[PDB]
């Protein structure tokens, strides 16, 4: 038997709606929740922020600011990790980083922001993850 | 020549980005002939070659995309000058139109093109209408 | 996928192996006022409307 | 699509004496023949100049719709055109397409050498803005209003 699979991503754009002003957020993730972001936060923090969750637990994610209101929205890319057959059985499985899963939503909450009318942290997928694995039978 | 050298959100914060002077219609200056000796009808007069000029221009998308905005009003009055007003114009109106589409028993069929009425409608501007036929019914 | 590359080369010269190994043709059409629609003109989606109106 | 498909004969009456049999009984699958295309008509209204208030009627040749409202939905211009008796229970589908963006431009007038303006839209309006804003700072200032977004 061989096997081949195809990582596609996990993409989530955050935004901060009702443009705000001063004060900070947090992110919630499977119910592991981030130490709390500014309003004006570079990606580089926000990817740290990020990457201390006990269910990411590595710098395996990456974000870049569209810059629309500071930073604002963030781009969050899965797997991405910037700012031998039998090894399973010897407890060094080769799999490393998250990438390639289909990441549930992450959840937003305004935390302490305040600014403009009917602030909300907002949060969509660009780009839902999948690996597919293809199972070939040989010999 | 008055204009040169020899994050969106910055402006609540007081870290403004719109340094330096230059595209502005600055008043012209005068020159005074004092402690000035050694000629005859002596003076330093001063002309414009060339006006400064800003037009901001304003482009409403995504959210309000669709939407026919009202016109932007300004107020000079925080402005510090000899005789200040402020220009605004619509370039482009915005909209979206009803699209209407012919069906079922009138599927393939050749229909009036429709007329608006508009004597009831009030405020706005040259409150008017339009009617486009993208297909002949066929 | 492919190279395209230069130094100071013309257009053509620059395409001709490129359009050759791809089986690419340029084509070009110049537009006539009152005749031809406008050349970036075309029709989307259900109901077959534009893709930008005006 | 439902469609007709034909076999049709072009046998070879003619063989060589060495020629191949299969040619004498040769038929053609024809293509696949479809019913009547039908075009649906479609047409745009459009209402300009921004009205506030009061309504329009439509004619459909020689009927009127009952009045419809400056601010009414497609499913409200839809239950107008229906009740119109050149039109029945489905005959008449309607939606909204096709955005154009407001574009408007602003411009200062006189030695303005230093303070701040303000811009109003609708009746919201912004922090001052300053003498010698750039691009990014007039859309903060817009961007900072209660009906405008960030993206917008």
Same mark, same amino acid.
């Given at each position: 038997?061989?096997?081949?699979?195809?990582?596609?991503?996990?993409?989530?754009?955050?935004?901060?709606?009702?443009?705000?002003?001063?004060?900070?957020?947090?992110?919630?993730?499977?119910?592991?929740?981030?130490?709390?972001?500014?309003?004006?936060?570079?990606?580089?923090?926000?990817?740290?922020?990020?990457?201390?969750?006990?269910?990411?637990?590595?710098?395996?994610?990456?974000?870049?600011?569209?810059?629309?209101?500071?930073?604002?929205?963030?781009?969050?890319?899965?797997?991405?990790?910037?700012?031998?057959?039998?090894?399973?059985?010897?407890?060094?499985?080769?799999?490393?980083?998250?990438?390639?899963?289909?990441?549930?939503?992450?959840?937003?909450?305004?935390?302490?922001?305040?600014?403009?009318?009917?602030?909300?942290?907002?949060?969509?997928?660009?780009?839902?993850?999948?690996?597919?694995?293809?199972?070939?039978?040989?010999? | 020549?008055?204009?040169?050298?020899?994050?969106?959100?910055?402006?609540?914060?007081?870290?403004?980005?719109?340094?330096?002077?230059?595209?502005?219609?600055?008043?012209?200056?005068?020159?005074?002939?004092?402690?000035?000796?050694?000629?005859?009808?002596?003076?330093?007069?001063?002309?414009?070659?060339?006006?400064?000029?800003?037009?901001?221009?304003?482009?409403?998308?995504?959210?309000?995309?669709?939407?026919?905005?009202?016109?932007?009003?300004?107020?000079?009055?925080?402005?510090?000058?000899?005789?200040?007003?402020?220009?605004?114009?619509?370039?482009?109106?915005?909209?979206?139109?009803?699209?209407?589409?012919?069906?079922?028993?009138?599927?393939?069929?050749?229909?009036?093109?429709?007329?608006?009425?508009?004597?009831?409608?009030?405020?706005?501007?040259?409150?008017?209408?339009?009617?486009?036929?993208?297909?002949?019914?066929? | #996928? @492919? &190279? !395209?590359?230069? +130094?100071?080369?013309?257009?053509? /010269?620059?395409?001709?192996?490129?359009?050759?190994?791809?089986? #690419? @043709? &340029? !084509?070009?059409? +110049?537009?006539?006022?009152?005749? /031809?629609?406008?050349?970036?003109?075309?029709?989307?989606?259900? #109901?077959?409307?534009?893709?930008?109106?005006? | 699509?439902?469609?007709?498909?034909?076999?049709?004969?072009?046998?070879?009456?003619?063989?060589?004496?060495?020629?191949?049999?299969?040619?004498?009984?040769?038929?053609?699958?024809?293509?696949?023949?479809?019913?009547?295309?039908?075009?649906?008509?479609?047409?745009?209204?459009?209402?300009?100049?921004?009205?506030?208030?009061?309504?329009?009627?439509?004619?459909?040749?020689?009927?009127?719709?009952?009045?419809?409202?400056?601010?009414?939905?497609?499913?409200?211009?839809?239950?107008?055109?229906?009740?119109?008796?050149?039109?029945?229970?489905?005959?008449?589908?309607?939606?909204?397409?096709?955005?154009?963006?407001?574009?408007?431009?602003?411009?200062?007038?006189?030695?303005?050498?230093?303070?701040?303006?303000?811009?109003?839209?609708?009746?919201?309006?912004?922090?001052?803005?300053?003498?010698?804003?750039?691009?990014?700072?007039?859309?903060?200032?817009?961007?900072?209003?209660?009906?405008?977004?960030?993206?917008?």
């Amino acid at each position: 038997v061989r096997v081949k699979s195809t990582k596609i991503n996990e993409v989530q754009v955050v935004e901060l709606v009702g443009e705000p002003t001063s004060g900070s957020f947090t992110l919630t993730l499977d119910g592991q929740t981030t130490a709390p972001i500014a309003y004006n936060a570079t990606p580089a923090t926000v990817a740290a922020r990020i990457a201390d969750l006990p269910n990411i637990d590595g710098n395996y994610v990456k974000v870049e600011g569209l810059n629309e209101w500071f930073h604002s929205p963030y781009r969050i890319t899965f797997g991405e990790a910037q700012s031998f057959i039998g090894g399973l059985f010897g407890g060094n499985a080769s799999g490393k980083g998250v990438g390639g899963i289909d990441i549930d939503e992450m959840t937003g909450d305004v935390g302490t922001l305040s600014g403009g009318a009917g602030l909300d942290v907002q949060v969509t997928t660009e780009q839902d993850g999948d690996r597919l694995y293809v199972v070939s039978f040989q010999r | 020549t008055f204009g040169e050298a020899q994050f969106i959100g910055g402006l609540f914060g007081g870290n403004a980005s719109g340094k330096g002077v230059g595209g502005i219609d600055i008043d012209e200056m005068t020159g005074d002939v004092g402690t000035l000796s050694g000629g005859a009808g002596l003076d330093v007069q001063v002309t414009t070659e060339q006006d400064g000029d800003r037009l901001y221009v304003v482009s409403f998308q995504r959210a309000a995309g669709g939407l026919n905005l009202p016109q932007l009003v300004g107020n000079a009055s925080g402005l510090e000058g000899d005789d200040l007003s402020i220009e605004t114009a619509t370039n482009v109106d915005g909209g979206r139109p009803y699209v209407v589409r012919f069906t079922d028993d009138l599927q393939g069929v050749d229909v009036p093109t429709m007329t608006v009425d508009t004597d009831d409608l009030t405020g706005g501007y040259e409150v008017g209408s339009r009617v486009v036929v993208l297909r002949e019914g066929y | #996928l @492919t &190279i !395209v590359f230069s +130094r100071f080369k013309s257009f053509h /010269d620059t395409a001709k192996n490129v359009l050759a190994d791809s089986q #690419l @043709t &340029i !084509v070009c059409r +110049r537009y006539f006022h009152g005749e /031809d629609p406008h050349p970036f003109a075309e029709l989307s989606g259900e #109901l077959g409307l534009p893709l930008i109106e005006g | 699509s439902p469609a007709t498909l034909w076999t049709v004969p072009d046998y070879k009456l003619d063989l060589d004496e060495d020629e191949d049999p299969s040619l004498g009984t040769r038929r053609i699958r024809m293509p696949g023949q479809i019913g009547g295309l039908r075009v649906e008509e479609v047409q745009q209204i459009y209402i300009d100049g921004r009205p506030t208030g009061g309504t329009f009627k439509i004619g459909y040749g020689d009927e009127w719709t009952e009045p419809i409202a400056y601010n009414a939905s497609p499913n409200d211009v839809r239950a107008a055109l229906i009740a119109l008796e050149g039109i029945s229970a489905n005959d008449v589908e309607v939606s909204l397409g096709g955005a154009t963006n407001e574009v408007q431009t602003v411009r200062l007038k006189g030695g303005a050498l230093g303070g701040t303006f303000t811009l109003s839209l609708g009746s919201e309006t912004t922090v001052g803005i300053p003498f010698n804003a750039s691009d990014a700072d007039l859309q903060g200032a817009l961007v900072g209003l209660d009906s405008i977004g960030s993206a917008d």
